[PDB]
Design an enzyme around this catalytic site. Structure first.
Site, PDB file in Angstrom:
ATOM      1  N   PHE D  67       0.867  -1.302   0.066  1.00 37.56           N
ATOM      2  CA  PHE D  67      -0.001  -0.087  -0.044  1.00 37.56           C
ATOM      3  C   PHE D  67       0.804   1.483  -0.090  1.00 37.56           C
ATOM      4  CE2 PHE D  67      -2.496  -3.106   2.442  1.00 37.56           C
ATOM      5  CZ  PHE D  67      -3.490  -3.264   1.464  1.00 37.56           C
TER       6      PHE D  67
ATOM      7  N   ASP E   1     -15.210  -5.031  -0.840  1.00 38.72           N
ATOM      8  CA  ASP E   1     -13.827  -4.959  -0.736  1.00 38.72           C
ATOM      9  C   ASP E   1     -13.519  -3.336  -0.673  1.00 38.72           C
ATOM     10  OD1 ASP E   1     -12.965  -7.669  -1.115  1.00 38.72           O
ATOM     11  OD2 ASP E   1     -13.758  -7.262  -3.302  1.00 38.72           O
ATOM     12  N   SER E  26     -10.174   1.620  -0.270  1.00 36.29           N
ATOM     13  CA  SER E  26     -10.033   0.655  -0.942  1.00 36.29           C
ATOM     14  C   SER E  26      -9.042  -0.501  -0.582  1.00 36.29           C
ATOM     15  CB  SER E  26      -9.647   0.837  -2.484  1.00 36.29           C
ATOM     16  OG  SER E  26      -8.674   1.889  -2.402  1.00 36.29           O
ATOM     17  N   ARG E  27      -9.591  -1.696  -0.517  1.00 33.06           N
ATOM     18  CA  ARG E  27      -8.426  -2.566   0.349  1.00 33.06           C
ATOM     19  C   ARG E  27      -7.329  -3.353  -0.734  1.00 33.06           C
ATOM     20  NH1 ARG E  27     -13.488  -2.946   2.516  1.00 33.06           N
ATOM     21  NH2 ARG E  27     -13.619  -3.398   4.973  1.00 33.06           N
ATOM     22  N   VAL E  28      -7.937  -3.339  -1.990  1.00 35.29           N
ATOM     23  CA  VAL E  28      -6.827  -3.841  -3.034  1.00 35.29           C
ATOM     24  C   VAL E  28      -5.571  -2.745  -3.004  1.00 35.29           C
ATOM     25  CG1 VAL E  28      -8.011  -2.598  -4.746  1.00 35.29           C
ATOM     26  CG2 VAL E  28      -6.638  -4.641  -5.306  1.00 35.29           C
TER      27      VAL E  28
END
Ligand SMILES: Nc1ncnc2c1ncn2[C@@H]1O[C@H](COP(=O)(O)OP(=O)(O)OP(=O)(O)O)[C@@H](O)[C@H]1O
Ligand SMILES: [Mg+2]
Lengths: 57, 245, 49, 116, 182, 50, 116
Positions: D67, E1, E26-28
């Site tokens: 991330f 998600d 957003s987790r992606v």
């Protein structure tokens, strides 16, 4: 009688530099602003005329 | 909903408590300001007595005593504070200043102004009005140095208008003022506080009806008057701060 | 005093260059947008046919 | 967590940080609405200390690599104890606001301070 | 998600997309988006979050220092930049160019009221001059140091060429004289 | 996606589910319309992989 | 309502009016307790403008003939949009508030204002 003109010309020269550079910069700014404004205008009115003729056809 | 109500309740409760706390801050500083304000009385009384005694036996003639024969312009100075949350104090100052400007506009004179404080400075910055010089950062606690320098500036500005005929600066070389005004606020009582505007640029003498001078009497006289002006200016500041609090 | 009249030629020259370049750019983007809108009109004419 | 089986150093560490956070929550809405200008000197210094502590608590994790591009870091316990004591006694009140966010360690804090 | 929250208050404020960045997530992550996007933009959501928090916190502050004022200005520029009107399709290269110019502080000079229009102007000029740089992105999905230098030189020249269109009751004080009135 | 805010904020990758929630008179249909119209340029090329 | 169907001036004026009203609604919470003294002039100006416009939205329709005993009025849209643009410009701020109650057009506005 040859010394009053000395201070007179000194005072004139001290300020004429700033006056002339300010005039030149102002004239440059005016001319560039006018050129950019006229070009951008020309673009907008040409786009409007194209939009209108495209609508007609 | 529930979370919004709880948040608003806690918010308003803490707001109330700390408004009371800041009210206590103001109450605490009131005592210190009141104690400090009344410490300059003997000096002013002595200096006024000295001036009375000297002017009793002296010639009555001075640029600060004589009046300009023509109404060219008139200066003014406006004071304010250095912190907000004062209520209508600054609004009162602005109304009094505007009404004095309106009264002066009847003669058509173009006036000039000086300001002290951030709030009035910003308000006049937003409006279309010219400013000569601003002083800020000591309304919370003034001294003698700032009052002395302000008085010096005002005195020199008044003197620099000796021969300003029309737009010509004359031998002065700079356009000078012919009249000065001061607007501030007075501490009538714990709940009575009103704006007072007064004129003190040209001296006036009134005979109420009915010593020896080692130096020149006129030398003593013209050395003396600036001290009196400075003392008046300094005395105004503490009064203004106390009324503000 | 002699130096005073030097930069004015530069100012005039750059003004002329700016004017001609801005006219060129206006002409170019005008003709390009007109051509693109004309092509879109032709495309929608084919679409309506 | 108790002085019985663990040194009381940790104990007054926790007590200092917890009381600081509690009074900070008490004064939050006041600093939000009334303004920071009305707070007392002790309250202003404490609020600054609480901001320092709140900013320092965050830390990157290696699982955030997908991330955020910054790699994570790990720090031992005794050094953290010493660093928190230094923070809570009030010597690091001169660092800027951003200098305490997303910090690996004390040396990382010094490097980021030298980066600004 | 992942989800995006929309509120009417932001819609009335002026933000046409009216998406709340405080809650949306957003987790992606950025693994889906292109590598050039990841290099150019990173932790922007964070920066906007501290900006909004600082605006809410210091709405009534008496004094601001240089860092706080600079952060306020930067966040104002970014929040005004991201707004987009309806029916405005865009390509990825223009998006990355806009983000690149916004993030590096090159536009800090212009006042707020003209931050939008200026952007729409520059995108036009790059269309006719140095267009191949866009081409490079299409076959690189990344930026090069030479291309970045060319772009920064071009934008500096343009901003040098470009101009900003905005920017009674009166009391008296006297002296007492014991001498009898003449 | 055509709108820059979504891609700059929360990227969308193929095979991922995303939710849109909001009140009335917000404009949530507009985002879907924008994406659908944006897909035309991608479909212009004949490769099945795009 | 869309710029493709409606003139651009109408769209812009409507958007500005909505923004001003929304801002006043947002500040209504804070002004409810303190008032206008703490509020800065930069927002006092918009407060006055918002109050004047929201009072100007009133009208005297014919339907009240049996309640107030006064004839109503009708206004063309061009006059409405030009008057609202003038009002948003801030030219009318010097006029008193109570002059904007139950008025038909800008000419009647001026006549009523000068009548007091
Ligand atoms: N970017 C934009 N700028 C300006 N106006 C916009 C923008 N996006 C949408 N609008 C306008 O906002 C309104 C949204 O209409 P829309 O039908 O999408 O509403 P919705 O909130 O999704 O509700 P629903 O689908 O339940 O009717 C329309 O008037 C549309 O023209
Ligand atoms: Mg809809």
């Amino acid at each position: 009688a040859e010394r009053e003109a000395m201070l007179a010309k000194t005072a004139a020269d001290n300020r004429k530099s700033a006056e002339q550079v300010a005039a030149a910069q102002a004239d440059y700014e005016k001319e560039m602003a006018e050129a950019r404004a006229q070009a951008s205008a020309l673009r907008d009115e040409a786009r409007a005329a194209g939009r209108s003729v495209v609508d007609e056809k | 909903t529930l979370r919004e109500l709880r948040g608003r309740i806690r918010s308003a409760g803490s707001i109330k408590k700390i408004t009371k706390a800041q009210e206590l801050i103001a109450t605490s500083r009131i005592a210190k300001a009141q104690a400090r304000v009344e410490a300059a009385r003997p000096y002013a009384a002595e200096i006024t007595n000295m001036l009375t005694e000297l002017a009793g036996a002296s010639a009555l003639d001075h640029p600060l005593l004589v009046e300009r024969k023509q109404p060219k312009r008139a200066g003014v100075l406006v004071v304010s504070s250095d912190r907000g949350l004062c209520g209508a104090y600054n609004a009162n100052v602005l109304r009094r200043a505007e009404e004095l400007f309106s009264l002066l506009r009847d003669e058509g004179k173009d006036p000039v102004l000086y300001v002290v404080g951030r709030k009035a400075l910003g308000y006049f910055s937003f409006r279309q009005r010219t400013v000569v010089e601003s002083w800020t950062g000591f309304s919370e606690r003034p001294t003698y140095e700032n009052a002395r320098e302000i008085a010096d500036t005002l005195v020199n500005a008044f003197m620099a208008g000796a021969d300003d005929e029309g737009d010509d600066a004359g031998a002065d070389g700079i356009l000078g003022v012919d009249e000065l005004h001061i607007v501030f606020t007075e501490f009538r009582s714990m709940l009575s506080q009103t704006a007072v505007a007064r004129r003190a640029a040209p001296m006036e003498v009134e005979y109420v009806g009915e010593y020896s001078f080692e130096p020149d009497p006129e030398t003593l006289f013209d050395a003396l008057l600036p001290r009196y002006i400075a003392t008046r200016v300094y005395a105004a500041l503490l009064e203004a701060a106390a009324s503000e609090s | 005093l002699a130096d005073a009249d030097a930069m004015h030629a530069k100012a005039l020259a750059d003004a002329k260059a700016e004017s001609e370049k801005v006219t060129e750019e206006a002409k170019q983007d005008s003709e390009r947008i007109a051509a693109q809108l004309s092509e879109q009109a032709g495309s929608e004419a084919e679409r309506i046919k | 967590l108790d002085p019985a089986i663990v040194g009381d150093e940790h104990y007054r560490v926790a007590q200092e940080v917890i009381r600081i956070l509690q009074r900070y929550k008490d004064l939050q809405d006041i600093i939000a609405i009334l303004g920071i200008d009305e707070l007392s000197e002790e309250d202003k210094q404490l609020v600054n200390r609480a901001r320092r502590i709140e900013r320092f608590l965050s830390q990157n994790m290696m699982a955030a690599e997908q991330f955020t591009g910054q790699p994570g870091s790990t720090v031992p316990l005794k050094e953290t104890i010493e660093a928190f004591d230094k923070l809570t006694k009030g010597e690091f009140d001169h660092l800027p606001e951003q200098a305490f966010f997303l910090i690996g360690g004390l040396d990382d804090l010094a490097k980021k301070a030298e980066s600004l | 998600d992942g989800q995006c929250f929309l509120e009417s208050d932001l819609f009335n404020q002026g933000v046409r997309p009216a998406i709340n960045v405080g809650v949306s997530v957003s987790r992606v992550g950025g693994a889906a988006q292109i590598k050039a996007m990841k290099e150019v933009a990173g932790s922007l959501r964070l920066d906007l979050s501290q900006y909004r928090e600082l605006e809410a916190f210091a709405a009534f502050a008496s004094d601001l220092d240089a860092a706080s004022k600079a952060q306020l200005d930067r966040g104002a520029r970014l929040v005004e930049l991201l707004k987009q009107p309806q029916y405005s399709p865009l390509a990825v290269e223009e998006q990355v160019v806009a983000i690149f110019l916004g993030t590096q502080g090159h536009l800090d000079s212009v006042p707020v009221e003209d931050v939008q229009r200026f952007e729409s102007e520059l995108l036009e000029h790059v269309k006719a001059s140095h267009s191949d740089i866009f081409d490079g992105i299409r076959e690189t999905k990344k930026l090069s140091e030479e291309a970045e230098e060319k772009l920064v030189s071009v934008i500096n020249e343009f901003k040098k060429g470009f101009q900003a269109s905005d920017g009674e009751d009166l009391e008296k004080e006297s002296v007492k004289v014991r001498k009898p009135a003449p | 996606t055509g709108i820059k805010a979504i891609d700059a904020m929360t990227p969308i990758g193929r095979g991922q589910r995303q939710l849109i929630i909001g009140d009335r008179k917000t404009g949530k249909t507009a985002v879907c319309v924008d994406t659908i119209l944006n897909q035309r340029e991608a479909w212009l090329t004949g490769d099945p992989k795009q």
